[PDB]
Each structure stands twice: as C-alpha cells, then as structure tokens.
C-alpha cells in the first residue's frame, strides 16, 4: 500500500534552516514527481514545488523559490525540502504529496520561535460521581504548559475511540499552549475499566501515560 | 498565479439538502481544475480532478462542472460524513494554485448542552496552580455564554475556552472552559460554579462544587 511517511513535528530557531524528509514506498518511487504544499493555520493552502525523482530537475513556486530547496535520494526513495532564514511567517504545517495528489503525507508541523521546547505535564479531569452524571459519565486529561505544538493524545492506547473528543490547544498568556482530552462513557464501568491517556509531544520527546480514577 | 476565488467562506446546510461551492479564475484555465475534501485532522484527500471526473471511492453524490473559468462542485445529498473544509485547485498553470477554501457545517435541531466540573487535581495544586474546568457536551448551535462563577461572584480574563469542530456523527459541538487562578485564592473560596446561558434553555443552567478533598 502507498505511503509516505514524513518527519515529526520539530521545533527550529528563528534565523535557522530545516530539511524535512518523505520516505516513499508501495510504488515505484522514481516514475511519479512529487509535491510539497504548506498550509498554516487556518489559512489556505499554498503549493511549494515539484521535483521530478527520476533526472532530478525541479519547478519552484517563483516565491519560496529562494527560500526553499528540494533535493532526493535515488535508492532510499525519499525527498528532502530544506527552508532557509526562517521566520515567523514560515511556520506551518508541510505536505508531501505524489504527483497528482492522490497521495499526501501525514504532514510535518515547523514551529518557528527563539523559545524552547517545554514537555507538557498532564492532570487527569476525574469523573466525578457526582457532578457528571445522567447514566454516563465524563473523565480525560488535562494537557498544561507545553511549547510548541502539536501535542496528540489517545486513550487505552488506542483501544478506546469511541466518546473521545480532544480540543484544539489554547495558547495561554504564558505563552505556553494548553489542552484537554475527555471522553464519555457508562457510569457502571468507573470500578471496573481502568482509563489511560497516553500523551505524545515529539517536539521534546515526551510520553506520558496518566490513570483517571474516580476521585474520592 | 491564476487567482481561484472561492465562495462562499463558509456555508451551511442540512443532512439531505444539497452544497453548491464556486471557484472562479482569474483567466481561462480550461479543464484542469481540481477540488479536495480536508475533513478536520487529517490531510486533504482528492475528489474531483479534471473538472469532473471523481476520484475511484468517491460516491456519486459529489458532483464537479463547469468549465472555463467558473466552476463548481455540488453535493447532492449532504451527510454528516461530508463536514468538512474544501479546496478548489488549479492545474493548467504553474504555479499551482489553491482557492480559499469553504467550511461546510451543518444545520439540526437545538440541543441544551450536558454541563459537567472538575475540581483541580491534588496533582497541580502541589505545582502552585489550580485549574478548574467546566465541560459543555454535544450541543447546538455553537453559541454558547460561559459565565464563571466563584463564591457568588463573576470572574473575568481569568479563563480560557476551546470549542470541538462539528462532530461527525451528531452534528453537536462541544465546549471546555477552564478557570485558570492560584494555589491560593483556590484554597479560600468553597463555591466553584459553572453558568451556562445557552439559546436552548429558559434560564440559565449551572453545576458546581465545593473542595471536598
Ligand atoms: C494538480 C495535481 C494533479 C491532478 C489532480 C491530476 C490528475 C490525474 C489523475 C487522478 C485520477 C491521474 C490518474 C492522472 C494521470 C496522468 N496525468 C498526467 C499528467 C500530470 N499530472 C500531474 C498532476 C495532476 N494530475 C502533472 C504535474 C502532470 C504532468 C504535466 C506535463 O508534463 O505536461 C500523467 C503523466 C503524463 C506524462 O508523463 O507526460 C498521467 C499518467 N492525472
């Protein structure tokens, strides 16, 4: 199956350049060009440029045509883009797509700033026997003080799926982004399932994993 | 740079009603033009291309035409799974280009909203803080009046609020606020409540608590 899995989110100084990378497989690397497109939050989408994996020649958007480059590796199939003299204005999330856009990446989210990394800590929103009631009954974790983003959070190791809803992270005065991750689930099971969420900031290599129990 | 102009910005209609977007260029393109669906998260996933043709898997509900320099995409039978961003794309003219992209939310009946607390756990009270958080579930529409209420009295640029994107099962929105205060003034005060002033009650509804332990 066609995939093409991409860097993690990473953080990098205002003024410094980074190379993102797109591991391809599941087809013949060298017959499709490939794409690399930038969004940025909430705006638009802006297509990069192309390269052709094959000879090695390369179309650039006449805008990050300084800013960026784009470059391949023949035998571990994967294309490099590399940014220059980043700033503020360069943070966004990267796409790496096959040529006719069929196929995109997972993207990569670069976070331009003179700050530094900061691993979220993580306290659970206890169900409350009491004040989350009507059958079922509400839990999750509260993901506080962490830079930058993103930061993912799955439940049960992924076992659990279902009444979960993660809110988008807030950005606090601090400067610091905050978030939360509850989920729904029957009242009846708060003595009997144990619930985990497992939290995920690549951006300092930070895994933690926090038990909700009913507080008492 | 052939500018795709997209309308609306943001539209909105009901499970079973139909979605019409436009995308107008800037100059003639001809028939390489594109439209992508990004539902929240995820990356974008390709629907139409070549004006009208859909993409293998794409169900025939989602229609591309036009030609030219205006184009259009259609959805015959809106349903919950269709909630998402699209993008109209142009590919005749280097560079690529993009429109601004449409919001597709959906109409449904009201709900009240289900208002849940939290106290602060004794986890971060230790690290000098106290974060409450008030959770309003599955609710429509999103407009909805948080007002945090400590001891009989309102608070104020003291707290945060984020609000879900549209579910995509139950068309309801969901919202968090949290009151962020110290350590401190959270071990004086007893009464932490939580008003909520939604277009779908009489009065306003309020849970609350008082730090047991
Ligand atoms: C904007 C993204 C994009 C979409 C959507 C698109 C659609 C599309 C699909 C989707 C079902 C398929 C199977 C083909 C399938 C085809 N479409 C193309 C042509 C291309 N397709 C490309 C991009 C592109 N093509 C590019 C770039 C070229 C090359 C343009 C040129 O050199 O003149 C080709 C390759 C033609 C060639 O190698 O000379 C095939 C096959 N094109």
């Known amino acids: 199956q066609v995939q093409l899995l991409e860097s993690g989110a990473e953080l990098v100084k205002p003024g410094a350049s980074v190379k993102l990378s797109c591991k391809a497989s599941?087809?013949?690397?060298?017959?499709?060009?490939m794409h690399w497109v930038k969004q940025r939050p909430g705006r638009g989408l802006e297509w990069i440029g192309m390269?052709?994996?094959?000879?090695?020649?390369?179309k650039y958007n006449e805008k990050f045509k300084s800013k960026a480059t784009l470059t391949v590796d023949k035998p571990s199939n994967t294309a490099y883009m590399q940014l220059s003299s980043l700033t503020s204005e360069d943070s966004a999330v990267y796409y790496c797509?096959?040529?006719?856009?069929?196929?995109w990446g997972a993207g990569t989210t670069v976070t331009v700033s003179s700050a530094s990394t900061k691993g979220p800590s993580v306290f659970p929103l206890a169900p409350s026997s009491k004040s989350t009631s009507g059958g079922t009954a509400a839990l999750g974790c509260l993901v506080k003080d962490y830079f930058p983003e993103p930061v993912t959070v799955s439940w049960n190791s992924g076992a659990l799926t279902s009444g979960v809803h993660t809110f988008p992270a807030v950005l606090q005065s601090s400067g610091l982004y905050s978030l939360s991750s509850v989920v729904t689930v029957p009242s009846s099971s708060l003595g009997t399932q144990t619930y985990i969420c497992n939290v995920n900031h690549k951006p300092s290599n930070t895994k933690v994993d926090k038990k909700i129990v009913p507080k008492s | 740079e052939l500018v795709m102009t997209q309308t609306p910005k943001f539209m909105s209609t009901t499970v079973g009603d139909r979605v019409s977007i436009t995308c107008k260029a800037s100059?003639?393109?001809?028939?390489?033009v594109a439209w992508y669906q990004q539902k929240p998260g995820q990356s974008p996933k390709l629907l139409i291309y070549?004006?009208?043709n859909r993409y293998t898997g794409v169900p025939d509900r989602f229609t591309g035409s036009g030609s030219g320099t205006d184009f259009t995409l259609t959805i015959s039978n809106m349903q919950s799974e269709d909630l998402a961003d699209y993008f109209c794309?142009?590919?005749?003219?280097?560079?690529?280009?993009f429109g601004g992209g449409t919001k597709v939310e959906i109409k449904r009946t009201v709900a009240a909203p289900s208002v849940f607390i939290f106290p602060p756990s004794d986890e971060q009270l230790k690290s000098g803080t106290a974060s409450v958080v008030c959770l309003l579930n599955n609710f429509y529409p999103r407009e909805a009046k948080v007002q945090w209420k400590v001891d009989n009295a309102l608070q104020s640029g003291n707290s945060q609020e984020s609000v879900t994107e549209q579910d995509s099962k139950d068309s309801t929105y969901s919202l968090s606020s949290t009151l962020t205060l110290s350590k401190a003034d959270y071990e004086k005060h007893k009464v932490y409540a939580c008003e909520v002033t939604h277009q779908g009650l009489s009065s306003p509804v309020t849970k609350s608590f008082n730090r047991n332990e």
């Open positions: 797509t096959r040529r006719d856009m069929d196929y």
């Open positions: 599941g087809y013949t690397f060298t017959s499709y060009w």
């Open positions: 390269i052709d994996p094959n000879s090695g020649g390369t």
């Open positions: 100059q003639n393109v001809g028939t390489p």
């Open positions: 070549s004006a009208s």
């Open positions: 794309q142009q590919y005749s003219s280097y560079p690529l280009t």
